[model samples]
Target: MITDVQLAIFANMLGVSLFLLVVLYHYVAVNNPKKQE
Candidate 1:
């Protein structure tokens, strides 16, 4: 019931966080250029 909805929201948040992390990592690595070292 209510617990299920809360759990679903948490799961969705986790997925979104991971997606953002990967995108941010690539953006920094490719755009920063300093990390090429």
Candidate 2:
């Protein structure tokens, strides 16, 4: 059973992961655009 706490944790992690991913993608796109695959 998925409790509220578990769901909240999942959401928090997902949000953080996605946020960092975007930040990283932006840096990569700007600094090393050619290395993008």
Candidate 3:
């Protein structure tokens, strides 16, 4: 029962959430390289 508008909103939310996760992960990795080892 999802409409086109609802689908578009879901896509947008997924994209933004993924983008933020990547950015946050990158930030942490860069700041804590020693932790990786």
Candidate 4:
């Protein structure tokens, strides 16, 4: 099916982006958290 190629592209994009997103989240969350003191 034509959707096969589309799925492949999305799969890698999601995996790679997911890794970066998570790392960036932690990187910023720890270094730039808002305090309520």
Scored by TM-score, the top model is 1
Error of 2 at 34 (Å): 0.6
In the order shown, what is each candidate's alpha-carbon RMSD? 3.4, 4.7, 4.6, 5.4
lDDT of 2 by residue, 1-37 (tens): 5556778877889899989998998888889949576
Per-residue CA lDDT of candidate 4, range 1-37, in tens? 5556878877888798989988887877778866223
Q: What tens digits encode model 1's per-residue C-alpha lDDT throughout 1-29?
A: 65568788888898989899889888898
Candidate with the larger lDDT of 2 and 3: 2
Candidate that beats the other on lDDT, 2 or 4, i.e. the better one: 2
How many angstroms is residue 35 displaced in model 3 relative to the true structure, after the best TM-score fit?
Answer: 4.6
The residue pairs in collision within model 2 are: none
Q: Compared with the true structure, what per-residue lDDT tens digits does model 3 show for residues 1-37?
A: 5557778878889899989988988888889866443
Candidate 3 positional error at 19, Å: 0.4
User: What is the TM-score of candidate 3?
Assistant: 0.50
Question: Model-by-model lDDT, in order?
Answer: 0.82, 0.83, 0.80, 0.76
lDDT of 1 at 31: 89
| lDDT of model 2, residue 9 | 79
